[PDB]
Each structure stands twice: as structure tokens, then as C-alpha cells.
Curated annotation (Swiss-Prot), chain A:
Present with 5300 molecules/cell in log phase SD medium. This is DNA-directed RNA polymerases I, II, and III subunit RPABC5. It is found in: Nucleus, Nucleolus. Zn(2+) binds at C7, C10, C45, C46. The gene is RPB10. It comes from Saccharomyces cerevisiae (strain ATCC 204508 / S288c). Component of the RNA polymerase I (Pol I), RNA polymerase II (Pol II) and RNA polymerase III (Pol III) complexes. Component of the RNA polymerase I (Pol I) complex consisting of 14 subunits: RPA135, RPA190, RPC40, RPA14, RPB5, RPO26, RPA43, RPB8, RPA12, RPB10, RPC19, RPC10, RPA49 and RPA34. The complex is composed of a horseshoe-shaped core containing ten subunits (RPA135, RPA190, RPB5, RPO26, RPB8, RPB10, RPC10, RPA12, RPC19 and RPC40) where RPA135 and RPA190 form the DNA-binding cleft. Gene3D superfamilies: Homeodomain-like. It comes from the Eukaryota. There is a cross-link at K59 (Glycyl lysine isopeptide (Lys-Gly) (interchain with G-Cter in ubiquitin)).
Curated annotation (Swiss-Prot), chain F:
Component of the RNA polymerase II (Pol II) complex consisting of 12 subunits. It is found in: Nucleus. The binding of ribonucleoside triphosphate to the RNA polymerase II transcribing complex probably involves a two-step mechanism. The initial binding seems to occur at the entry (E) site and involves a magnesium ion coordinated by three conserved aspartate residues of the two largest RNA Pol II subunits. This is DNA-directed RNA polymerase II subunit RPB2. It comes from the Eukaryota. Belongs to the RNA polymerase beta chain family. DNA-dependent RNA polymerase catalyzes the transcription of DNA into RNA using the four ribonucleoside triphosphates as substrates. Second largest component of RNA polymerases II which synthesizes mRNA precursors and many functional non-coding RNAs. Proposed to contribute to the polymerase catalytic activity and forms the polymerase active center together with the largest subunit. Pol II is the central component of the basal RNA polymerase II transcription machinery.
Curated annotation (Swiss-Prot), chain I:
Belongs to the RNA polymerase beta' chain family. This is DNA-directed RNA polymerase II subunit RPB1. The C-terminal domain (CTD) serves as a platform for assembly of factors that regulate transcription initiation, elongation, termination and mRNA processing. DNA-dependent RNA polymerase catalyzes the transcription of DNA into RNA using the four ribonucleoside triphosphates as substrates. Largest and catalytic component of RNA polymerase II which synthesizes mRNA precursors and many functional non-coding RNAs. Forms the polymerase active center together with the second largest subunit. Pol II is the central component of the basal RNA polymerase II transcription machinery. During a transcription cycle, Pol II, general transcription factors and the Mediator complex assemble as the preinitiation complex (PIC) at the promoter. The chain holds residues 952 to 1119 of 1733 of the full protein.
From Swiss-Prot, chain L:
Keywords: Acetylation, DNA-directed RNA polymerase, Metal-binding, Nucleus, Transcription, Zinc. Belongs to the archaeal Rpo3/eukaryotic RPB3 RNA polymerase subunit family. Zn(2+) binds at C84, C86, C90, C93. One of its GO terms (cellular component) is RNA polymerase II, core complex. The gene is RPB3. DNA-dependent RNA polymerase catalyzes the transcription of DNA into RNA using the four ribonucleoside triphosphates as substrates. Component of RNA polymerase II which synthesizes mRNA precursors and many functional non-coding RNAs. Pol II is the central component of the basal RNA polymerase II transcription machinery. It is composed of mobile elements that move relative to each other. RPB3 is part of the core element with the central large cleft and the clamp element that moves to open and close the cleft. Seems to be involved in transcription termination. This is DNA-directed RNA polymerase II subunit RPB3. It comes from Saccharomyces cerevisiae (strain ATCC 204508 / S288c) (Baker's yeast). Component of the RNA polymerase II (Pol II) complex consisting of 12 subunits. One of its GO terms (biological process) is RNA-templated transcription. The keyword Nucleus applies. The chain holds residues 3 to 265 of 318 of the full protein.
Amino acid sequence: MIVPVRCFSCGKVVGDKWESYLNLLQEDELDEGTALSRLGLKRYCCRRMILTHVDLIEKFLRYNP
Amino acid sequence: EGLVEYIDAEEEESILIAMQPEDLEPAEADVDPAKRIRVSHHATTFTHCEIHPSMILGVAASIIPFPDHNQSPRNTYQSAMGKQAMGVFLTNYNVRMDTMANILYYPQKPLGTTRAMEYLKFRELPAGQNAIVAIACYSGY
Amino acid sequence: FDMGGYFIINGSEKVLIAQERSAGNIVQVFKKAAPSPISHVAEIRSALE
Amino acid sequence: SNTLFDDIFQVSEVDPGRYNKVCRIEAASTTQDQCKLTLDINVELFPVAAQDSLTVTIASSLTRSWRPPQAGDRSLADDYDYVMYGTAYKFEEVSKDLIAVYYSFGGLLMRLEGNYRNLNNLKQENAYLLIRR
Amino acid sequence: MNAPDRFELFLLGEGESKLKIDPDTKAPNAVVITFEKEDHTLGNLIRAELLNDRKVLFAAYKVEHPFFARFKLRIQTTEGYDPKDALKNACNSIINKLGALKTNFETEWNLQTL
Amino acid sequence: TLSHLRRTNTPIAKPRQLHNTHWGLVCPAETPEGQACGLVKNL
Amino acid sequence: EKAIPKDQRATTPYMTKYERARILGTRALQISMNAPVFVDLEGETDPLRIAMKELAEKKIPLVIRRYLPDGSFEDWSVEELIVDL
Amino acid sequence: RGNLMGKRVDFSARTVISGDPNLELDQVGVPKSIAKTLTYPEVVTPYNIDRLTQLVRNGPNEHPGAKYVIRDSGDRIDLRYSKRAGDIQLQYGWKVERHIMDNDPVLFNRQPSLHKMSMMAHRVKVIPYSTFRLNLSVTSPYNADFDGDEMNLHVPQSEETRAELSQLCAVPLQIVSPQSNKPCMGIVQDTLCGIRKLTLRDTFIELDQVLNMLYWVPDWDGVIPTPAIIKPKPLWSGKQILSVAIPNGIHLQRFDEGTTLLSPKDNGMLIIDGQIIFGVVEKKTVGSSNGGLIHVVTREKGPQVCAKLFGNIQKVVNFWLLHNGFSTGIGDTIADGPTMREITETIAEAKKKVLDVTKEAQANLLTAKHGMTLRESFEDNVVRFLNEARDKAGRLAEVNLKDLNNVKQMVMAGSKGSFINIAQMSACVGQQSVEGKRIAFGFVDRTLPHFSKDDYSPESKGFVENSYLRGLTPQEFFFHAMGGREGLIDTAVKTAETGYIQRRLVKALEDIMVHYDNTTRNSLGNVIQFIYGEDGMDAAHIEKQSLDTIGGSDAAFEK
Amino acid sequence: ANWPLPVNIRRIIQNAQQTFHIDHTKPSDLTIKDIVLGVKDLQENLLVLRGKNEIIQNAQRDAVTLFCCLLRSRLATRRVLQEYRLTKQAFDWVLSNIEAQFLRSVVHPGEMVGVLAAQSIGEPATQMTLNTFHFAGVASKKVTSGVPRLKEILNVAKNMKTPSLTVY
Amino acid sequence: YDRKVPSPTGEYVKEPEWVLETDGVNLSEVMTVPGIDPTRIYTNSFIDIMEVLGIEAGRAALYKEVYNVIASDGSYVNYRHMALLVDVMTTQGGLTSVTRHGFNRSNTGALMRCSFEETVEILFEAGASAELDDCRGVSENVILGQMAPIGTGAFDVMI
Amino acid sequence: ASRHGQKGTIGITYRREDMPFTAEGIVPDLIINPHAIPSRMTVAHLIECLLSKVAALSGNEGDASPFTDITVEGISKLLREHGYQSRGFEVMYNGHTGKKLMAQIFFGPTYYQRLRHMVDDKIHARARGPMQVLTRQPVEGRSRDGGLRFGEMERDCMIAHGAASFLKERLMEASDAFRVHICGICGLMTVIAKLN
Amino acid sequence: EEGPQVKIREASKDNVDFILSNVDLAMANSLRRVMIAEIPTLAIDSVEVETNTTVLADEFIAHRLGLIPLQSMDIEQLEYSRDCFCEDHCDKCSVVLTLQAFGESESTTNVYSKDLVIVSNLMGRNIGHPIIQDKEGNGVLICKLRKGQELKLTCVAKKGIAKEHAKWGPAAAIEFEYDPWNKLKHTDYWYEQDSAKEWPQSKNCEYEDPPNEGDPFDYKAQADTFYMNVESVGSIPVDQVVVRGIDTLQKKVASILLALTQM
DNA sequence: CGATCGTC
RNA sequence: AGACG
Ligand SMILES: [Mg+2]
Ligand SMILES: [Zn+2]
Ligand SMILES: [Zn+2]
Ligand SMILES: [Zn+2]
């Protein structure tokens, strides 16, 4: 459904961090907590934003038109 | 291979069931005060064992976090409500012409999960958000 | 993610709700109320499969 | 007017019964071998330990909206450490020649047993309590 | 559907004036000012500064309803002190404190690296 | 949806009650409030 | 026939709440319909607030027919009825 | 029933209800959209002509405006459509269907309406947003909460009809209920919780805050009360500032337990000339209690005054608490390691008592007392032991809870929670029951298939040893579920049955009215009572009073 | 001793005490006659029924029997002087206050007293949590209570579930 | 059973006494048993009290029972309300039920009764026996769309 | 609603500033009442939050599965390791004043659900409109601009109040009311309406 | 320099850690509030959709467009359209952005905030350039395209404050702590055994001396010295969040003073 | 021959 | 029928 731009609670821009997060896990082998903190997501409200994101867009683009 | 078996309430009558495999049948011969109180053995002539006691619950209740720490009617109430919640009901929602459809803009997978949610495809089609919440007396509103 | 198990009748998704009935061919004994002359009754709801 | 009562007491007990700012004080007059006092004190701004010798004073002056202290040129009857304003609620007679007086200081309760100050302590929304040393 | 516009929080609407000065009924040399299109940012700030004034006998503010972005400020001063002047002085006292802070931060900021 | 497709109906001595025999079979929690409480079950 | 004369009147000398409310209702309805006011106004404009004044200053020209269970009745003027409450 | 006794009506509105700390007790918050829909027929008099023309000019979509204009001949001019919409030159005698304005009387109702208090007149206050707002202290007569509830609003179309609401149905008049001869409205939730907290002997507030709290009371005389403390700080007590909301001429005396005029526990209650002398203000003082501040104030000062009182109390308390705060965590359910040890062993000795009595029964030594079965006595014993167990364990928990315990605090204030709550959440859930007895052998000779046949052990027949904090076992879980279900079934039955009872009760006594000869008669004029309630007194004007001649010793009577 | 009755006499006394600034240090200006006859007159002045005939006269006397018991017990000579410390000025005020408050406390003709009674019972019946009584821990304590019992009552049920006899 | 009894010194004293509770009813017979206090004998069966002791005794028991239902729940309702309910069942000479069998059969208005239960058949026997409707009932005026003789409508207002 | 039988509506919306805040600068998206807890005994709700706070911090999924060995103590040990008081409590500062709250708030994430049936889908208001054919009574439903039911139950409350005219009004002027012609002799609807 | 004092601990292009000594809490707060709500920025406040053959709804997209941070450096030399004498919008009051994207490749195509194009005449001022902090150089993922998928739209970015909509938030999160030892007794700690042991020490404890056990409570003491950490979203630099913060608040106090002269 | 309330 | 308090 695409990472939200900005964290609902605080507004720290989180939209530019997904591509990066996904890479940190898949390529860098890293675990979520370290990956999250590496993206500079220190506060737990920002953390939930990315950690709890379900990227349903990927599934939606699989439909033909 | 007959490692597992299908039992109905009628046959259930003739069998003796263990709740946990290990925790219900190893050996005997200090503890954690935080952990709940489980009885002992006493009954040892076992014929079967439960696959997992959480399997006694259905879809709605399999969504609740820690229902074992809740008053029984509240677990019944939640069960009714989860069916009134919004989120992606299906991936092809954009493709169906249906009377009423409510889809959450940014649905989130819950931080607190049940092993049963893996099968219920909840983390894949969620019905809520992980809201930062304060239990507090603020404006009284 | 769709699970199926339903029908499509004139474009409408239809669920058939499981219908609970007492099982047939069972013998069951019952006591009876204080006025009744018949104190107990044995019953069988015989049916053909 | 002026003072209505003045005496030096000796603290027997100091009890913080379910409180962390307040303490009920049990004290008897050093001079008057019959006079007694029971009082709730704010130990946070003014602490009291056991066996302390405190000068207790009951006055009536130093009506209208309260003006902040303003040490600009002001001067109150203060040569004391603890000052309280309160109301008279009951005048009880503890047999023949023994009287008791009841003062609430916004809920901080006060009792004074003896007889000496008959025509001094009267039914008033007025009453200032003054403690020193 | 019954939601007022968000501009109504900081925008005065035809007929509404910023300050409304009404003389207090209950007390002498006391006044009540209705600050329109304002909140806790201005209320608490001015009320706290007014208190720092020795000649000010009373200063309290309130926001009667969270729906509406207005507040009330009650000022009572000593005789020979117009509560309006007290409010004015408080405002100037605030700006001076603010000005000082602006410069200080800039001074410290320009000493910093990264 | 998954829940709907796992529902039970009981038309018509104590059917509304959670009988011991329901263990592992029907959900102990999930039942409608009032109207058809215990008559509508879930596997 | 039937009635009850002024002398010998057992009913409460005090006006009932229901009598008051209906009185204030009927009066406010008259005031609302450009009917003359029997009292002075203190810049008053509300028909109910005006009726309240007219009652407070006992200048409501109305009578209450208090039917008793047989059918008999006691007529009491608004002016005579005590309005404590 | 559906067309004569009751029917669908014009001039009605319905929506989700919300709570408003800033609404007067008798007010109702009406969405501007609804206000614009509902109208009142108002005749053109020289008293209103200026305002009416103006409202006509404002039209149907801008708020203080009107929808239709009716003249002689009986013809409605639709302001939203008419070409002469902004041309209306008003005449006296013409009616102007104006929007619902502030302070109008409106009939507010919550279903089911099994009360005169379920239906009360409210002063309109036109507000933004889509919900109907009401003061929390009007919640209980209606039996409303804000979990999604909806309410009904009715508008009188006649002057006499609007008099009937303001003079009979009005919220302030309804305060002291004739149903239980006590008030039917009191201080609740945040306000009830905060008022305890504000009242404590420890609670001291200072100038900055004091002045704000003082100003928050609308009625405030503008007089700063003299602080209880004048020493190294002018410090006002919580009691002081709260007494500012209490009007003068108010006297209240109580005495609870250890209460003795020097109240050491800061308990009971004593208020003189409206100044709280001693005692913490909780439910007994400020709830819908019999001798409450509310019952007293309505009686002494009047309805209009007592209504204001809810507002003034609310305003201070809500304010102080907004700045004090109040929360509840999981930590509030955690009882001491040593307390837990005692709870654990308490339930252990209960388990033995049961076991020993069982061993006695099985030995044939058990002798049942006259009137009951050997087994009937056994079960009565086991159940007794097991309830005692839960009660001792719960009492052990309660005792360990500190005055800083948020649940303990809520119980102390009387806002939320009871003993059982503390007990089941933190010590032991206890025994489960179906049809009065403990968990039955649904399976042949066993409760569950994980048990052996003929097991009468607490654990086997539904005893939940664990607290909600520790967690329940699958067996405990299912058993608590069996009990829970029973609750739900008869909750659903109670709702159905009591409702039917209510109709019958109503139909049967509809026509019973107090006549002009103080007699209680029906539609046929048949005498039911000669004096209403045997004294010809109205229930609202009645109070529990001590008859000083009935009790005491013959010596003490004489003295 | 504690029974719902009109006119909170205690509150009136406290109101007299504060209003007139009563000092328990000065002797009252009252008489045995002032008190004794004063309380006695007040009794003749408490109205519920106004008719002058013997039937209604006795009906009225009977209606205020209990309240006068209260009135006497509270306004006794020893109490008015030793306990309350009333003055003639303050005592007379008490007497006219009771009179007015009592007349205020009387029911209003037109009160839909029947509907009131019906709802007054109906509402709390709705609130009745459980049909299962708190005697469900002891075997020799089972007696049909709550909503079922209330149903048995209103229906004048011939065959009741727990017919019981209590022998003294 | 616990008993509040006045001591010889004046004060009321808790004096416990032996009391017998019974499964079943035969009031008439049990009350004549020696050793019992016939003045004190009680039954939850108000209808049996009514039969043996009389209507006024029945009324007392009927209240006592209604009272106990409310009291048990913890709740309190002012005496006058239940008093009235009980007095209503009582005024007919016997015990009249709060059903279509007790009050809906009473000598009241045809339209006021057809408002509760047996709607159509109540209206049939009204036409059959040719009943005259008083219209002095609440329910009648409700049907007729008139200001009923209730509070505000209980009296008439004239000039 | 929370995932614990905890349904409740929005009472008001506050912006970031007016909201209470953490020393970290965190602020709630939701403020629930302390009173919604005692009576309800929904301990799992509190446990969920503790677990969820730890889950977000550690970047792991919280196991809220039933019949397990996860303890409030085990969760507390992990949360404190993350630098927070072990029982979810956090110091909060008042948004209006900046002043620390005397009380510490149980703060942390909790999975909440957006539920169907919203104010706007419920708001109805009808000051006259469509009348049903047979009855000449207001229609039934928001979609039809229907009249709200003033049932017999409602009628009874107005009788209790003794509000005779309001009751007359509700049942006539608002809703029904009709002018009919009757014969003085037979008393039936026989009189032919031949107006003008 | 007089009154309030600053002491910067940490400073970066994104964050300011500092101590606000010699100030009132009322001021500390008013500032904290104004940094959050009242500093004006430039955000998209109008989206015209020409083509939308995407998986997402027009408004869903439009909503995220407002959330993209845009350069607000010279925002004061841009008018609020409500004050502008134009018909609707112009260059004196707004910045116009273009977004046109087509899924040419078989593989999934991403739409970034780099893909926005300023079409408006900027008249030389650092305004409207989408904020890019992403290392790869494409800050924020607007949406995703498949194949025939197309997104043609036009954006009108306008001046505004967070008080109207959170999108106009220059800020983000502001850390705020005073008296890290509770010497003021401004809070009453919830404990079980030991408040000291149960409650963790803040970093700010190093910057203050402990209370020293056997000392009587300082009654008269007041709050001065506030440990703050202003985080920027990037639309305006960090110094500027604080400087415009002070400035905005200063301006509104001047407004009151000014309105007293108007009466 | 009865069988809670409102609503889609 | 279905959903809600
Ligand atoms: Mg509800
Ligand atoms: Zn964040
Ligand atoms: Zn004819
Ligand atoms: Zn322009």
C-alpha cells in the first residue's frame, strides 16, 4: 500500500526509507531492529511505521491492467 | 503413518488426552512465580495429546492477543467486533463491483500476534493500526 | 488469498450455513413430569440414509 | 486583636499516617501540666522531629481579597517560621473546667485542651496559627 | 460534515476583532480580555509574565471550549495601574526576552560545526 | 469472511450453553450477543 | 349545578405545578399572539418571561376549574392561588 | 401499539452522543446541521419583528436563519426556493419557521425509556461537529455511555408545549428523583476520581494554578481566599479551592468509621457555610447519594443552583486533574513477591481442606445434616472452602496495594472497580459455575477428556486458581468460558423479560392519578388509596430521618 | 430509627444556628411555654387535607402521626435548650420554616402517580443483574429470586417454584 | 435467625432465636401446631396468606414479597410505588394479576384495555355487549388525539 | 476498538501541541480512559501494550499467543533493558503548559481497529416530510427522510411528567391529526364532506 | 547579552541539542508549541489529476503529495494566497509542480519526489524544490507503476502552518525535559520497591548535581534550564526552525501590543 | 395467547 | 431477515 510519507505520530519523513530498509534486510543480511536504527528511526513511533508496514501495492500491481 | 488421528465427541469419551506433549508426559523427581499455575500429572494412562490447546478457538478469537488474560465475555465481545473492522478484505477489491466496501488507507500488521494468525492470513490482510496510545485523564473529553 | 467454499447465484456470493440437527437412529431414555402416568420413555428417531 | 493564645509545647509523637507532605503532631504544654495540642503540619515546608520545643501562637490579624505578600514595604506579625489561617468548628467541654477548641486549616485539623483562654477563642472564620523554632 | 474550517483557528471572520476589553463586574481595577483566534501559546505566556509584575493582583486565563480558538484573560492591578498597561508591559517584557534569545541562539549556532 | 464460512445454525434442553463436548470442536468464545446466543456457533 | 360556592373550598390554596405550567403556557401563547400585556416591561421580549412577570405580579386574568371525582368543581383565580414552589 | 399509542413524528433528530466537560448540566450540544434542519413556528410580534426579518434574511443555509415564512390564508413561503426569498417584508401575525436557536427547550431521550428521567427537556447550545453533546452528570438517568449510543431530540411547536418542558421536564427539576427519594445524578468518572485526589490532606496548590482554578468557576466572587498556609509559601489546600464551587448556606455532616470531630483518617465529611472543614470528597459526598451535597443543594438553594453546582465542580476538578494527570498500567495489577507467596499458599490450604473433606466423604465418615444429601452437603462445603480461598487471596492483594495504586485509587474514589476486580485481576479468578453448581460432567464421569473419571478436585470442576495477570490454563479457560456464556444467555433473557414486565406494570397503572381531594383514583374514579402513599406526600420531598425516641436505653431516653 | 420523612429538621436547626449566630455561652430567651406550646401549635398547622368534618379531620391527623413523632422527639424542651441552644427569634423561624417546607412537600393533584410507580419498579427490575441469587454457595438457601420471582408475583402464579414456610 | 429485641434496660439487643424453614406449604395446618408462634408464621406464598389470613394480610405479604425482590438486588424503591402496585391487585377483594387475565378483564374502558393485549377480541365483546367508553382514561384520549386529564389536562382553564 | 472488547467513539481531536508529550517528543495518537479498565478486567489489553512497546523498540514481533510461557515479568525485563520503566509508565508533560504531569502515563503502541457505522452514516433530522399512504404518518428511515419513533414507551414518560399538551402535540400536530365529520344522531363517519 | 541563554550540545543539518537556561517554563513551552504548529512552510495544497491508471485512488495519491516536503527557505518572500490579490493562484503566492510518469519497463517503475518538476516562475528564491535526503537521491516514494500504468498530474504548492494541516509542519519531534532529578517535586513517581531503581536516569542528569539526601525541600524554587532537541523535516534548516520559532512567537506578541494601539 | 429498544 | 446499543 506504499510506506506512508511521514510517521503519523511525529511526522518524521519515512517515505524515503522503504527501498533502503528492504535492502538492509535482504542484501545486508541485518535484522529489523538494527536496520530500523541504521535508517535513523530512533523513536518507537517511527519504528512501528516501517516495521508494521504491509506493502499490498506489490500484490495490486500483479493484476494485469 | 498414524502419528495423528481424527476423533469425534463420541470417541473423545473413551480416550485420555495430554494438553502439552512434554509438559504433560516426561518424568518426575525452585519455580517461576510469574508463570501461571498448572496442576500435575495424576492421570498418566494417556492415549492421545492435544496438537495445541489454542486450536480450541475459531477465526475471530484466534485474532485476540492473550485471551487467556481476559474475562470471558470480553473475548466474546471482541469476536463480534472484529467482523465490523476495516482493512483489505481481498487484494482484487479495485476489480469488484460490490455493495459497500471499506478499505483502510495504510493497514498495519499488529506488533502483538498469535501463532494462529499465520494461517488466518492476518499479517497479509490486516484490519487495524498500531496506534501509540496513552491510558490517561486528559481534558475529560 | 480467496478461500472459496461459497456459490455465485445471480452475481451474489452465497454461504451455506451448517445446520445443526440431532443425530438419527439413537436410543435415548428420558424421565417424565410429576402429573404424567408414564414415568420414563425410551425413544429412537429412526431414519434411512 | 492582637494575640488570643501563646505557649511553648513539647512534641511527643510525629505521625505520617498515609501522607508524605503532612504529619499529625501530638504535644503538651511545657509550663501548663494539663494543656494539650493535636495538629496537622506540613513537614515538607516545616519539619518536626520528636521532643522538639515549639512556640505555638493563636492570633486574629497580621476579610477582603488576598493580596500577595509584596515585601516592597509590607510587614506582618511574622517573627515565626510556620503560619496558618483557619476556621473555628467546635467548642467542646471535656468536663467541668476543661474545654477543647477545633480549628481546620483548609483541612489541616487542630485541637487545643485546657481552660485558661475562655473569652479569648470565640466562634470565628478568623484565626491565625503561628509556629516558631 | 459539521466540521468548521481549519483556517477558523487563526483567521478572524468579519465582525470579529482580536481583543475585546470588558470591565470586570465583581472587582475594582479588574478587567477581562477576549483573545480571538488564539490558544495556550499566547494565554499561558502572557498570564505567566503578568504574574512577574508586582503591581498585578490577579492574572488567570481560560479556554472555555476546545472547539473554539479563543481565550479569556482576567487582570486585576493595584490602584494607579491600568490593567491595559500591565498587559502592554508584559508583552514588551516578552519580546525583549525573546529578542535576547534569538541573538544568543544565533551566536551559539555560528560557533558550532556540523 | 473466513469466520462466516465456519458458522453453524441451530433451529428450535440447553442449546445456548457451552457444553463440555464442544471442546476442540466449536469455539468457546465466538457467539452472537442476545438474539441467537449459543444457537449460532463457529468451528 | 354542579359547582361549589366560594365558602367551603377543601382544595389546596397553593397553585399546583401543572396549574402554573399550563397558566404560563396559555399566557405566553396569548402574549406571542399580540395580545395586551397587563404588566410593565423591563426591556422584556420573551412571551414566557413576560407571563412569569404577569404571574409574579398577580395580573393574569384566568381561573382554574378544579374538577373533583364526582364531577363537582372549585373555581380558583390565579390572583388568589398561592405560588410558593 | 404502532400507530395510536406510539407513532413516527415530525420535528425530531437522532445521532451518536458524545460527552462534554464544558456543557451545562441542562444543556444539549446540537450540530449546526441538525439546528438548521429543525424549526420552531414563531409569530411576528413587535417584540421579535427585527430579529425575525434578520433571520429570514440569513436564510435556510446560514445558521441563525429560517426555513419557511407563513402568512394569513395559511401559505408557506419556502425560503430555500422562493424568488422573493430576499424580499420578504414581514407582517405581524405571520409565522416564521426559524432554526433551533440557543437556550430553546428540547425534549432529549435515550431508548429504552423506562423512566421519566429517560426523557428530559434541555437548553439548546448550537455547536459544530456531528454528535449530540451532553454533560456527563446527565449520563445515568438516560443510562447512556459514549461507546456508540444514539439519542432522540424533539422540538415543541407551541408556546404552551415549550412551557411544559421548561416547567415540568427540565433537567434541573429532575435532579432529586421520586423513584428512590434521593438524587438521580451525581459526580462521575474523571470528576469523581479527581475530586478524591484534589481533596487529600497532602494536596497543596499554589497562586499561579489557584488563580486559574478560581477564574474557572464562573460564579466566582473575585475574592482570593486566604491560603491555609502563609509560612515559606502561600499554599492553598485542595479542599479550600473546591469549596469555592460550593455555595454559601450549605451545611453537611456525616461520620463514617473512625470519624471523630478531629477526623484522624481524613474521613466522613463536615461542610459549614459551604466550606469543607474535613474529610476526603468521594462518592458518598458527591455521588447521587441520599444525604449528598447534591440532595442538600437542590433542597436548600434550588434546582437552577444545584444544576450550576455540577458545572462548577466539574470545571475546577477537570482542570486540576488535566494538569495532575491520571493513568493505569499493568504495574497496578502486580502484587508483591511476598504477597504472591501468601496468595499461592492460601489457595494451597484451601485445596487441602477440600481434599481432606473428600477423603472423609469417600471413607463414609461424612454425616449430612438434616434436610440434605451426603453429596449435597459435600458440594456446599467444597464451594465454601473455594470461595473463602479466592476472598482471602483477594484481600491479601488489596492490602498490598499502595495508595499510589491507580486501581486502588479508583475504588477509593468510587469512580471504578470493586474488591472482586482487584482479587480476580491480581490474586485469583476463583470458582466458575453453571446453573448454580460447579462445572458438570458433560462427558461421561468427567468435565473434560484430559481428566480421569470421577474427579471432584477443584481444578477438575472449574476452579480458576490463576489471576488474569498470571493467565488461565486451557481447562480454566474453557470453564471460565462456560460460566461467561451462562452470563450472556441470562443477560439476553433479563433484557427480554424485564421489558415485558415493564409494559404490563405501566398498562396496569396508567390511569392512577392523585385527584383534587388528595385521593388516589383511576379512570372509573375507584379509590386505590385515600392519601397518596398513606401520607399524601411527594416522594421527591422525602428524606431518611432518625426518630430519636424509638431507640436507646430507658436511662438515655430519660437523660 | 432511620425512615424517609418530609422536612429535614436537622438541616433547619443548623440553618437557624448559622443564620442567627448562636453562641452556646449565652442563656436563651425562651420559655417552657414558648417551646411546649410552640411545638404543639405547629402540629395543628401541618396541612395535607383541609376539610373541617370529622372523617377528613381524622384522616389528616392520621397522615401526620409519624411526622409529629419526629417533630416532638426533635423539638423537645431539654433538646431545644441543652442541645441546640435556640433563641426565641431563631426558634420561631424554625417553626415557620417546617410549616412552609411541609406544605411544599405535599403531593400535587394531577401527579400521574400510577405511571410513576410502574416505571419506579420497572427501571430497577431492568437493572437486576442475574436470576441466580448470592445464596448459590449453600444448598439449604435455594429460594427463587430476581426476575423469575418477580414474574411469579405479578402473574399471581398458582404453582410457585420455591413454596416455603417460616416457622417461629 | 438474628433478632433485634429490646433488653430489660431499654436498648435493642441482638437475641438469636431458632426458626424453621420449609419445603412446601400448608399454612392452615402448620399454624395450629403447638410450640409455634401463630402470630409470626410466614409463607412466601402470598396467595396462601390471602386464603387463610385475609385480603389485608395478603396485601402485606404481597408488598413484603415485591420489596424482597428489589432489596435482594441491592436496589431501593420508595415504599409508595410498590405500595400502589400491591394496593391495585388488592382493591378488587382478591388477588388480580398484572396480565391479560387480571387487569385487562376489569370494568375499565374498552379502548384503554384494547391498548394492552387481546386487542381485537376486547373490541368485539365491546361491540357485542354494547359498551359505552368513558374517555376519562389516558389511553382513550391518546387514541382520540385529545389533551387527556393528566397533570396539565387534569383541570380546565377559563377567563 | 482495541482487540479486547473495548468499543468507544472519538470525543474530540487534539493537534500535536495540545496533546500530552514524552521527554523523547513522542505523543499519543489516542487517549483512552483509565476508568475503562477496572470493571472490564481486560488485563491482556495492558499486556498487549507492554509487549507491543518492546516489539517496536527491539524490531521484533510480539508473541501474544494464548497458552504460552510469556510473562508480564519477562516482557518488563526486556522493556527496562531498552531504557524504559519496566511497567509501561512514562513521564508525560502537559501540552498546554510544558509542566510535567504529577502522574506517569501508561504509554505505548496498541493495535486499534476502525469500525463501520460513522456519525455521518447515522445523523438524521426531520422537521416534516413524507407521509405514508395508509397511515398518513411520517415515513420510516434516514434514506426516506423518516420520522423518529415516539413509541408508547416514550408516551408513558410524558404521562409521568404530566405534560398533557406536549403529548397531544406529538400525537397530532407533529405526525397525524385529521379533521373528520360525524352525525349527532348515529355518531358515525356518515357525514358527506360537501365543503364550500 | 541579557535574559534567556542557549548552549548547543549537538548540531547537525537535521537536529539541534541545546540547553535553554535563564527562561520561564511558560516561554519554553510557548516556543515548543510554536515550533510544532505556527512556522509557515510550503506544501502542495491542490492536485489536478489528468491521468490515473494506477493501483491507488486519486485522493490517496493527492494526500501523499501534500506530505512531500518542499523547500521553504525563502518562504517569507511568498504570499499566503488568501492575502494575494490574484484570481486563485499566481507566482506571488504559489509554486506549480508537474508529475508525469509512465511504466515503460516490464519491471515495476517507482515514482519519486525527484520526479516533480517546478513549472512555475520562481523569481529567484529557494522555494518548492522537493526535499531529498535519500542517499540514492530520490527522497519519498509517491507510488508504483506496472506497464500501461500512467500518472499525469499538476500540483499547486501553497504557504500555510501546521495549525491548518500537519503537512505544513517544518518541525517533527521536539525532545523536552526540565529538572531531570525531580528536585522541584513536579511529578510523583509510581513505584513498587524503589522509585530510584525502577525509573531510569535521563542523559540530562550529568548536567545537574543530585539533590543530596538530607536536604529540606526547596519550596520557592522554579523551572529554568530546559534540555531541548529540535528535529527538522528538512523544508527549513534546523537553526531556522528555532529562529523562525522565536520570531513567529515574537510577532504574535507584537500583534496584541499593536491591537491595543488600534483601540 | 403473550414474547426489550432503536435502526439498513 | 441482517446489524447495533
Ligand atoms: Mg451503550
Ligand atoms: Zn515518529
Ligand atoms: Zn347519522
Ligand atoms: Zn497570487
